[PDB]
Amino acid sequence: MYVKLISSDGHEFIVKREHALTSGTIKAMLNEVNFREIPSHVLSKVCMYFTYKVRYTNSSTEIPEFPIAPEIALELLMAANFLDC
Amino acid sequence: MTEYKLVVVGADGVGKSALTIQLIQNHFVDEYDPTIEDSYRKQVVIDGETCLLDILDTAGQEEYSAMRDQYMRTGEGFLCVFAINNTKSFEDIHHYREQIKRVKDSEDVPMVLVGNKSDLPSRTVDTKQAQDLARSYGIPFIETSAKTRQGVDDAFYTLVREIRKHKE
Amino acid sequence: MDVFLMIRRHKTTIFTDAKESSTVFELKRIVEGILKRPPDEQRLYKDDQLLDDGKTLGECGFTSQTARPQAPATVGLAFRTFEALCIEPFSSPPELPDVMK
Amino acid sequence: RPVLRSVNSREPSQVIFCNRSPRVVLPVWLNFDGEPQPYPTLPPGTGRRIHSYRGHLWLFRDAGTHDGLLVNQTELFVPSLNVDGQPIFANITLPVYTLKERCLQVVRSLVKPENYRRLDIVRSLYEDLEDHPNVQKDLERLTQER
Ligand SMILES: CC(C)[C@@H](C(=O)N1C[C@H](O)C[C@H]1C(=O)NCc1ccc2cnn(C)c2c1)n1nnc2c1CC[C@H](CCCN1CCCN(c3nccc(-c4noc([C@@]5(C)CCCc6sc(N)c(C#N)c65)n4)n3)[C@@H](C)C1)C2
Ligand SMILES: Nc1nc2c(ncn2[C@@H]2O[C@H](COP(=O)(O)OP(=O)(O)O)[C@@H](O)[C@H]2O)c(=O)[nH]1
Ligand SMILES: [Mg+2]
Numbered sequence: 089m090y091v092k093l094i095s096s097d098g099h100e101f102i103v104k105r106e107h108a109l110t111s112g113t114i115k116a117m118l119n120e121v122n123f124r125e126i127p128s129h130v131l132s133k134v135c136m137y138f139t140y141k142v143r144y145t146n147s148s149t150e151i152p153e154f155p156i157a158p159e160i161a162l163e164l165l166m167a168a169n170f171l172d173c
Numbered sequence: 174m175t176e177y178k179l180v181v182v183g184a185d186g187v188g189k190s191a192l193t194i195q196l197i198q199n200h201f202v203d204e205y206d207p208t209i210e211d212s213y214r215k216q217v218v219i220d221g222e223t224c225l226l227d228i229l230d231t232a233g234q235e236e237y238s239a240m241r242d243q244y245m246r247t248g249e250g251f252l253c254v255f256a257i258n259n260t261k262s263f264e265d266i267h268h269y270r271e272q273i274k275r276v277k278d279s280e281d282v283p284m285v286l287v288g289n290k291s292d293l294p295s296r297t298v299d300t301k302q303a304q305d306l307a308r309s310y311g312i313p314f315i316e317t318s319a320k321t322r323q324g325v326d327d328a329f330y331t332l333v334r335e336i337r338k339h340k341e
Numbered sequence: 342m343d344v345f346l347m348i349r350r351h352k353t354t355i356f357t358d359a360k361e362s363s364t365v366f367e368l369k370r371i372v373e374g375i376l377k378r379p380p381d382e383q384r385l386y387k388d389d390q391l392l393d394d395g396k397t398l399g400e401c402g403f404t405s406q407t408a409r410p411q412a413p414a415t416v417g418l419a420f421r422t423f424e425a426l427c428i429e430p431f432s433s434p435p436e437l438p439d440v441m442k
Numbered sequence: 443r444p445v446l447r448s449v450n451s452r453e454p455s456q457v458i459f460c461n462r463s464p465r466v467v468l469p470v471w472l473n474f475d476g477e478p479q480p481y482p483t484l485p486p487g488t489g490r491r492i493h494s495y496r497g498h499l500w501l502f503r504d505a506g507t508h509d510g511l512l513v514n515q516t517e518l519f520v521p522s523l524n525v526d527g528q529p530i531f532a533n534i535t536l537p538v539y540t541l542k543e544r545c546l547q548v549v550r551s552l553v554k555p556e557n558y559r560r561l562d563i564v565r566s567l568y569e570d571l572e573d574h575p576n577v578q579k580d581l582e583r584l585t586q587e588r
Contacts, residue, residue, distance in 0.1 A: 090375060097432050102355045102375055127432035132347070135356045137541045139345055139410040144538050146515055150462040151536040154411050156548040158441050159434040162563055165545035169567060173541045271493045278482050440557040441549075 092120040093135070099128035107138035112172030125170055130163045134171065141173075176225040177333050178247055182269050183254035184262040185232075188289035191319035192254065193230040196329055201320050208232055219330050226329070237272075246276045249339075250283040250332040255298065256290045257316075263298045263306075270310065283335035284312050287328050292318040344398055344408035348372060348385075350418040352429045359398055361405065366394035368416075378420055386417030386426055444476030445585050446518075449497030455521040456529045460489045463536045468505040470577060471498065478577050484534070496523050501577075502534045508575040509547060512537045517584060546570055 089105040091114070109115045111134075123131065137154065144151045156164060181189045190205040197215045210232035217224055229248060251273050255262040266286065274280050286307045288298070300316065307314035313331050317324035342362075348355040355375055359368055369380035385392040392401050408414040417426045448471070461467045461484040469481040469492075483505045484490060494500075500519040502511040513519040513534050521530045539547070549571060553561065558571045 095432070098352055099429070099431065100353045102353065104356070107356065129431040129434060132354065132431055134541065135347075135354075136411050136413060137544075139356055139358065139413070141538050143343075143345075143410040148515075151538060152409070152411065153464050153536065154539065154541075154544050156545060158548070158552050159437050161441070161545060161548045161552065162438075162561060163434060165542065165549060165567060166563060168541035168545055169564070169570075171541070267493075275481075280482075435562075438561065440554070440560045441552045 091118070093131060094120065094122040095126055095128040095131040096124045097128050099131065101131055101135050103135050103138055104142075107135070107142050110138050110141045110173050113170060126167050127163070130160065130167050133160060133164055134167055134173070137168075137173065174223060174225060176227060177336055178227045178229070178249045179252060179329065179332055180229045180231060180245060180248035180250070181252040181254060182231050182273070183252075183287075184256075184259070184265045187254045187256040187259065187262045188317075188319050189252075189254050190230050190232070192252075192287070192289060192317060192325060192328070193228055195319040195322060195325050197228070201322075206232075217330075219333050224333065226333070228329075242276050245273070250285075250336045252285055252287055252328060252332055254287040254289050255303075257288050257298050257300075258290055258293050258295045260297050263303070266306065281311075281339070283332060283339045284310075285328055285332045285335060286310070286312055286314040287324075288314065288316045290318060290320075291316045291323055292321045342405065344403040344405060345410045345413040346403065346408055346416050347413045348416045348418050349428045350420070351427055356413065358410075359403075361399040361403065362397050364395060364397050365392040365401065368398065369394070372418065382421040384419040384421075384423050384426070386419070387414070388417075389426075444581075445588060446472055446499060446581055447476040448472055448474050448495075448499050450474050451496040451498075453496040453523060455494050455496050455498075456524055456527070457492050457494045457521045458489055458529050458531050459484055459492050459534065460532065461486055461534050463511060463534055465509070465511065465536070466505040467511060467534050468503045468508070470501050470503060472501070472581075476581070478581070491529065494521050496521065500532070501580075503575070503577060507547065507550070508577060509539075510537055510575060510580065511535065542570075550574070 090102050091105050091108040093101040093103065114121060140154055181193055183189055185207050191202055193213060194202045197213045211230055213228045213230065215226045217226055253266055253269050255266055273282050273284065286303060288303050303314050315324050315328040315331060317328050319325060342360060343358055344361050345358045348357065357371055365385055366380055369383045369385060372383055373379055387401050403414050417428055419426045459469060464486050467484040471479045471481055473479050497520060500513065501517060502513050503509065504511065511534055513532050519532050524530060559568050
């Protein structure tokens, strides 16, 4: 099963349902979820965190650092605060 | 006039007090109170340099308080002494080095392994065992006898040189 | 072993994972289950390189070092003549505040 | 009184600290009264054979920022007795931080605390930025989660 996430600028991000449930706010709402508060370059980064979380939670290998460019840090912080992830 | 703070540690009865009194007062004490801990100062010429040696002859029961931790933290070099006729004293060396590493917040602390009472025939710890232990620690191993004065000056002067190499 | 990708066409981005040994055709079947288009009507790209169905993903250039969960590799997708590859760019972050240097 | 404390077992236990994280690890030992006691740090990718005791409690933090870290996939490490002298391994890694906490870390590392409130964010996040990682507070949370 997959979930479709719509950014505020109309980009469509299709992610595995289990990946989207990492967000508390998406979990509460739940096939398609529209976000007027997250642009595409931020929501794309958010989806990278989703696969990162599901891959490395309870991982028996070492966990790499999640990278965050300074230019996206402030907007990503607001998104994560809104998504509860 | 440079000063070197030396601390002599090891199990009770290994010869810490006898080694120290032999270095400063140049005589062998047959029965020094196992309870008296004191510091001794001596002006010595080591490799042409006149130094003040501040030797702590530790004694008493264990105490893992902040105050005793800090007291030992001030020592720049440690003489870890065991007796060749006492296996337990050799087995305790690991614990003494571990506590030195903890308070010095480092694993590269100037120290010398000392096998005392080398004048006694009743050996229970082999010199090869001590050489191997010293090699794994990366420290010199010196065989001493406070009674015959064997290696006594060498043990203390080598610890001073280990501090100098560490101070550079 | 596992490579993490984001397959992009126009304003659609698919976050999925695959095995480094899996082939390009097998990745088109993954897209089929999502976008309801058969592999015969899909063209996959790595940058501007048309990917041959028979080659594995590793042989195309997707490796664990370059296709990480936190940094997936981009795979362009075209649907059928075949259309020219078109990837609509994401939005842009604002200028970095001076308090952030 | 504190539940999270070391047991005074006095039974030695050989342990290997292994920093498999990109951070400088601050090993923190909870003494017999539950107080945190810092130990020498581990640069990234470094191992160290340490001398501990049975029933002693350990946690690991970022030496510079006190960010939380995991040991053997969990928050705390308690070595037991060695079986046939083989050492007990402690694999220290990053956790999977929440995206919000990872963002807080990156903003904390870029902005100076005086200029925290000069950012174009919500006032709620101004408090989250100033709420730096805290070992004593994490002990309260772990005590209650028990
Ligand atoms: C109380 C704590 C020290 C603690 C402990 O060790 N921990 C807590 C965590 O588990 C980790 C572990 C630890 O730190 N590992 C060392 C270490 C080092 C580097 C690194 C780097 N990273 N890491 C994580 C590191 C960890 N702890 N918890 N339980 C116990 C202890 C301490 C030992 C207790 C059992 C001892 C029983 N003895 C009775 C018989 C005779 N014995 C004896 N008799 C008289 C005196 C002494 C003695 N020993 O040292 C000293 C000196 C003077 C010399 C020297 C410097 C200091 S400093 C100080 N205060 C001293 C004193 N008095 C000394 N004299 N010894 C000895 C051999 C055994 C059981
Ligand atoms: N044969 C011999 N006996 C020693 C030597 N050093 C110390 N002793 C004896 O070992 C006993 C304990 O020595 P002591 O100085 O009290 O050691 P401490 O308890 O570590 O300070 C004393 O009765 C000494 O006479 C040595 O080098 N040779
Ligand atoms: Mg004495």
